[PDB]
């Protein structure tokens, strides 16, 4: 019954106003599903390749070639397959491209199809997406890791740390956790007026105030948590995405808060912040190929704090395996578009989970109205999601979808809360 | 649509000819599913309680009280629930019993319903059981851990080790792995005739030859592997279930091969066998509450060999958590009937997998024609199953079901093979 | 509507771990049915031929050639036929083979299809298999003839009689009859410990104790019946399968309990046991082509005791006709795989029933999880089944299926009990 | 699905213009079936009781009380039952009447319902009636036993033998057998004109010529067979229904061809005719309670000729059992209305078939347009039917239905031919 009958794509805009791919899949039983592909502002070196058109149109970021690839080549390869055979469909897509990085049809063309197929299979089975992907034990609502203040390559300030997140770990439920996050984001606006700092927003929906650096930024978020009537750490803890590749010079070191520092010095710095602040997680504290520094840092602070690989793993099973052997990080950031299929995303989660590593499902800078990642975070029981500040519908659509999943689960829902961060 | 409409149970016989519970669930959409409950010959102290009738009938092992509980109390609690809400159904069963060990309605009455509901939900979604429970990424065929020679409480011999298993890790596919296992079991019969040793079978379908002890038994299996044209270790490795509670005296020590030994001495013994034999796994090397010995042994040999907790964990999240904190074992044996629900089984797998621990899905001595555990092993991607020697349909029905799942997965199937045992 | 649309086979394992054929049939109305083929350890000379692959694989017992025959030749001959036309389908299979013994496609390839078609027709009619084959008057639950102690070619002992069965004839219902059988099998284990005799199992799930011979074996079973609180004969009677071909030399005589004896002497021996023991049935008391001895023996004791032809008839209408004319035996053992189709099985039953002969539906040494024979025994109202000891799911699956049929029939069920053996 | 929803009866006329019962049954799935009850001109003492109204209407033979019983009592007892549970339905009817002979609601009210239910179940299963009752092996077309010349209580002539039948045993198919029967009946009319004998018809559609007696009558039928171009015996054999109760005086003897004779003398007479004429069957050669004579006669000629019990058995399992023990007759006449249910009819067939006895399905003098008995004769593989001369649609409707069943069976049809009468 859930036989793929039709596949079409169109060019749409992402939350930053740049083009991205949207796919629709129709099954012979009348099932219709739609999936949209996110896009990162700055991409890892090792991510799957997005096909972009080049030329004058949309500053060269058009995706009419990806749309044409879905119609000319991918559609004809998957019509007649069963939508339930996700692995067969993703294999057919990977084999049809024939490149390691999906540079021929584009990670953007292939992921659209992989996701739309998974959605059509779940509709066909009459199961919500989280249940279809995760089975009947998918019930864990994740701690929302909300980026309410920006630095690094996301601003023109003194702050080299890219994202400052709040984590409402002490909340009893996801519905309360979301409210705590909202009320801290609103308090932080009011505190930014109090100090004459800018309340202008950036791409991920958080603030970019021109502050001294890392500790200044943390101090303001602590204020905001207290302003909201919540206790820092016990109620709302903190996390960073250093995105340290962005302030790394190839062969050279970490140009960080007006000094060049070694992997080991960055480590000293981070251990500093652990002592002074309620930190549950630090993502990309060192750069995408700094294999020895990462190993050193994990060994130094990995018992004290979740260490998350983003750019170093790019959701890539080959790269995560290298890090697990090397004792590199204790968590994986999961970005479906880094790898290009749902199948390869879940193989990477499996390697992580079976390996002792936690997962954090992540948005991209360039998001869509698509909420698949809220379903995915519950499906894999990550207990953690990074999908933005509680402002901008490309962020809030995910939180709204988590409210809906929590409601659907009833007394079966469990909020990960402090059990996501047992090192804290 | 998949609303529970009717629930009935009956008394049937298990593979040992003792009574057990069979449940049927009908949904309002016409879906009908049947599940049978296995039973262990010797049970752990901490396992969920089976309701048995007592009295003259079937040596007191009747289950007409469990059948009556399904009709009088459980049926009325779950009619009207949705079969897809496994967690809601299992919660309703656990709340209705109201005991920690399921001593009021019986782990046997509750598990029948939990399993039959999961089967009816999968039929209703039109998904094979492994896909419904594991999602579209369920594709790993497990290494069959085949018990071809018995000792301990399963014989009256000098052999204190309970089960001697072959593991066809070097096979390219599950279909070949099964054949390798069969051909080694058949070769071992012929080798047992050659030495005038008995070829009479026991409960798990393997041999119980009266041999010197552990090393004698290993030597005969090595012969059999070679007799089959396979290389010990590279093609067919070995595993034990010591079931060391069976030769443990409370407060006293391990009465093992004509000596009382300490946890540490047992450890010396096991490290001995690692050096001399291609061992991938040892299960219950020490007793169900020997928390300090287990920790010591894991630390000593856990890097060299999978260490499996059976009786020490009884598939119980509270007990597995205690072992993970204490650094006790690196794998969990998964026996649905030890805990009493599918929900609590998957919570225990989740704790294991997320914790770095491997899983091995297990049969019970008293099995049925039911093949749910073949589906479960693929659903959770355990990469390992312990469901008997390749003789007796209560064992072979599971292997036959794994052939069927492999065939259904097509080029999406992956055989766990040597990737199940990275320490070897 | 019940038009055969698809036919596929696969290689699976039987209860002895040797390969056998499994067939699936799909009808255009969405009906899906599965049937598995049993296999005998030692076969009659005149049985339908099993195709086996030869070569190294599985000791030459592979059935990939039978699987290929189902896909290459049988499938194409029966797609488009109506599943309800069993006789047309079986004729098409017999004509396509074109041999008298089914040596071209294999009795194993043809029976799989014949059985799977009958199952799909019954599902399509929405009738349980026993009702579809036997009509609305199929309601007689058979006396289970349970082989709890082995001799002959099934052991290396002094006992030349192959099977010693208990028959719970005085039971009020099949559910009680099964319990009586179980409780006698369990009592007999305990009595075998008491005498230091082995409790190791053989292929049919019974014991093979090294005892003096026939009378010794009977004495132990009588003890076991009494140990269970039942009266020998009135509650639990006895039956033998001598399988006398196994101890016959072509042209020479019956090498039986350390003497060569004539057909007439064997007869004297059997008449001896009738006098001393509550015997309801003796199967193959003389060899497969000893036409004159059989006639002599039937005339001598046929009024005192059921005499069953197994190897002499091989469920073959041509051979049963020869025996009915010659006054040879008063019952037929019915083994679907001896003849190769359901149609030819029922033609043989018809000849038997219309001829005054009773029928006993039989398992094979190599069984599957398939329970078709429980349905067949009720469908033809045999009042007698031989499907093993009440241990091993390849045996117990049949007894469990008889419990289910009894339950489905309600107050319409009748237990054959002592009305199966009017000579006793 | 095939749940009995509605049951209604009406009064209709039989082939003799007397009232009889017609029943309709509707199932909740929309299945509608109609059955009519035959009636015998002269009934056996032991037959099930027909309810008749008494009074002026239709000479007291009205059945409005039977119609009222179906609406007032039987309908309410069987609405809600499953039509497939024939045994449960027939039991409910037998229990509701509560008499041994069905004298409270009438064998006529109960049989209508039993038959209409069986028809509705077969429609619901989408199986022709013969296949639903007999299973997929129902394929034997019976030899038509055609009564072309009447005597006894069916005429006012010198002929005490009630029915003279032709049996086209040497025909290759039922379609040819029917034609042979027709052509002999037509030839016999022409031969009756040649001798100035009457060609006026009686109730069973045959001739009643005023001839000398038995041998005269046989001689005329032989002529007719030859006149048709067929060989007596090899092509068309003979059978009688003596109906000897009709010429028996209680305690006294057999007033037969102008003499009072003993059971033994009747026997001498019959053995006489065997020597002189190609006789395959003689029905009721002695009276309904002449148990010792019947036994004597069977022993004398039973090896030479089928001996059929009609009035002595009345299709009654209790009475057939008495005859089988006493060695009384070798065949049973099967008249559904003698017993009152389909279930009890098939129990009687089962006892017969399993007992070495043949069956002959029979019409009644008072028949309807109903053809159920053609289906029943194939369903039970009787190989013999007695349903009249090949004239009158109450007779020919059955033959026409056998043509239809033969056509539907295709190359699966087998004509019983000479295999119905192995003694000839
Ligand atoms: Mg990042
Ligand atoms: Mg164990
Ligand atoms: Mg035999
Ligand atoms: Mg008559």
Residue numbers in the entry:
A (entry chain A), B (entry chain A), C (entry chain A), D (entry chain A): 1 to 424
Sentences from the paper on this structure:
Here we present structural snapshots of Mycobacterium tuberculosis (Mtb) enolase in apo, PEP-bound and two 2PG-bound forms as it catalyzes the conversion of PEP to 2PG. The crystal and the cryoEM structures (enzyme in solution, frozen) along with the biochemical studies clearly demonstrate that the functional unit of MtEno is an octamer.
Tautomerization resonance is accelerated on acidification of the carboxyl group of 2PG which is accomplished through its lone-pair-mediated coordination with both the Mg2+ ions and the transfer of a proton from His154 onto the nearest oxygen linked to the phosphate moiety. To find out if the exact reverse of this reaction occurs during the conversion of PEP to 2PG, we systematically mutated each of the residues Ser42, Asp241, Glu163, Glu204 and Lys335 to alanine, compared their activity with wild type MtEno, and elucidated the structures of three of them [Figs. 4(a) and 4(b)]. Notably, the K335A mutation disrupts the nucleophilic (proton) substitution, the E204A mutation defuncts enolation capacity, D241A should make the MgA 2+ coordination in the active site highly improbable and S42A should absolve the MgB 2+ coordination.
